[PDB]
Design a protein around this ligand. Sequence first.
Ligand SMILES: Cc1cc2nc3c(=O)[nH]c(=O)nc-3n(C[C@H](O)[C@H](O)[C@H](O)COP(=O)(O)O)c2cc1C
Ligand SMILES: Cc1cc2nc3c(=O)[nH]c(=O)nc-3n(C[C@H](O)[C@H](O)[C@H](O)COP(=O)(O)O)c2cc1C
Ligand SMILES: *C(=S)Nc1ccccc1
Ligand SMILES: *C(=S)Nc1ccccc1
Lengths: 313, 314
Amino acid sequence: SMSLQVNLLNNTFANPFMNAAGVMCTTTEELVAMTESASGSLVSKSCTPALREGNPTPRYQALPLGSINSMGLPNNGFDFYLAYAAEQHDYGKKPLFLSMSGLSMRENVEMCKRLAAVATEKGVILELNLSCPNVPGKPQVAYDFDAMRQCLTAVSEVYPHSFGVKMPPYFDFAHFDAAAEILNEFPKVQFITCINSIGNGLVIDAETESVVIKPKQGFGGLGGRYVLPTALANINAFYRRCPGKLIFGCGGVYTGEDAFLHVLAGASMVQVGTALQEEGPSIFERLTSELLGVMAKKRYQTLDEFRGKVRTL
Amino acid sequence: GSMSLQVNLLNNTFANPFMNAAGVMCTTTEELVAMTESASGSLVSKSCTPALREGNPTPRYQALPLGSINSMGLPNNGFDFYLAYAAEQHDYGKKPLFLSMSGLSMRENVEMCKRLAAVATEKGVILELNLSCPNVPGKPQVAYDFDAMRQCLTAVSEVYPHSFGVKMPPYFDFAHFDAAAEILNEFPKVQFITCINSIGNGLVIDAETESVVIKPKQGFGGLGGRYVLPTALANINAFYRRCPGKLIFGCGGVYTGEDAFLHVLAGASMVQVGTALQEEGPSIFERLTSELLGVMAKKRYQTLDEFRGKVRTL
Ligand SMILES: Cc1cc2nc3c(=O)[nH]c(=O)nc-3n(C[C@H](O)[C@H](O)[C@H](O)COP(=O)(O)O)c2cc1C
Ligand SMILES: Cc1cc2nc3c(=O)[nH]c(=O)nc-3n(C[C@H](O)[C@H](O)[C@H](O)COP(=O)(O)O)c2cc1C
Ligand SMILES: *C(=S)Nc1ccccc1
Ligand SMILES: *C(=S)Nc1ccccc1
């Protein structure tokens, strides 16, 4: 007898699967579809205080090995996602995460102050997106360790609940150490989601001799097959260095086997982006079946039996 | 129509843009000779330290469906060995030679460069300075530490009276492309930039064995091959745009003439081959020249200059 059950953050999840923030979670219809899917949870589109159009199109391209995008945070605005959490979401069906991506400290502070009551009353959980644009001349927030520390200090000061942080990938042990040191100073940070896209790749179409997306001269974040080893690295790096926190995996999941690798590396929840974009929410029925299949063949009954247990040489 | 893969840079003529990536098939005399006898336009010797180095425990390289992962740990025969090859053995009549240098401090690079100067003058060997190299404990690789990078280029420029190039890690943010380019532009002796070294510290897990696949560093290692092509193209183009006074050498994800075509369209002058060369051997250069000419014929190009850096934006 097997189970994909996950228990964390004072909640029970039927399985570890959910969407990645930004994928199929912007409209009411999408949020309802995610809730009615086989997924263990869902997260709403990263939001700004007001509605945002996002970047000019084309801004997403599916690729043989994944995807490239420069969406530009198109979203319905904080009021919309707050109202969904407060009044519409069926918590009977699964827990809900709300992704927040303000473009300044002030924006996140003011949204968090309002989110507090809804988290208390309804149980929505914050995923704070630190893999977000910074002021002119500076890199994305989590690549600016001072901006990151300031952000976590401000949110921790004003937001009376646990929360999690969505992180970009790092590529150097000194950066894994520096980022973990900062995260470990904030006890309210109870989960870390690794990873957002590999930033600023450039896809060129040999047939057209051109880039494939319009914003930023064709530069955009990579997802899909491209990012799996990077995702596993980050999941495991933070699993090791932040032992008091949970890790959520994100990046490169197309199959139950991929999800199995996320969990071996240390993941508690497993988020699905590019594959979900291409297949729709029916993917969750397939992924749960496949993960159970993998577990059956390997003689595992629960996720606890192998989470974080990747063997080193 | 008569077509040509010829490249002209740093007072040299290259028959075609292809060469090995530093670290791949270029450590021993036998490998260096094999690269010289190959159809490649050039070659670069294994990144060297002042003395020989064993490198990391094995397994330290693993080929993968989508590329490779490695943590080699700079195994190399030492600077004297590569200097002697450049000074006394290399057949410059066949093709130009690059020497990759990866000292582990400023002093190490300064002392090697002082000795390299005369051989560069007399024989024409060209330095590729590897700044995608380990730094002091607690610090990231040198090119991720902008002050250390600047200090390294100042130290080398002071003692090395020739042009050289720099091998760079990938960056992932426009603010970093800007910062890096600003530093590189300060050093006119840096006449080429090689983009990119591996995507650092990936982690491959074998689902069957439930384990990592390399021994050093808990299985973490640099990614090469198909995984890295869009990242390589991005870096090639980012520096092509930001460093107009320099040439860019592409490295990352090249398996076919079409891939090389993309490198050139992004801005590459030379095109280095790593993972694919490791898997196929130096015969790969015959295939790659043929394929690139084929791509050019079908697209109606006769020279590389006709499309270098001309990628269309929307
Ligand atoms: C079209 C698109 C929109 C996205 N929007 C968001 C977002 O709003 N917030 C966020 O944290 N990540 C966003 N992401 C990144 C994903 O959440 C995920 O980190 C990334 O795509 C890697 O997962 P994959 O390999 O499963 O695609 C987006 C990705 C895509 C492709
Ligand atoms: C086994 C191995 C050894 C390498 N050694 C070096 C080295 O000594 N110096 C260096 O600058 N890069 C080294 N690299 C990185 C390659 O030069 C190249 O940047 C990287 O492999 C990406 O190219 P590819 O996608 O063609 O493999 C090495 C890569 C591999 C796989
Ligand atoms: C931190 S809570 N928010 C922030 C700071 C700087 C840029 C964007 C967002
Ligand atoms: C720069 S020339 N060399 C250097 C400095 C610090 C660490 C490694 C190499």
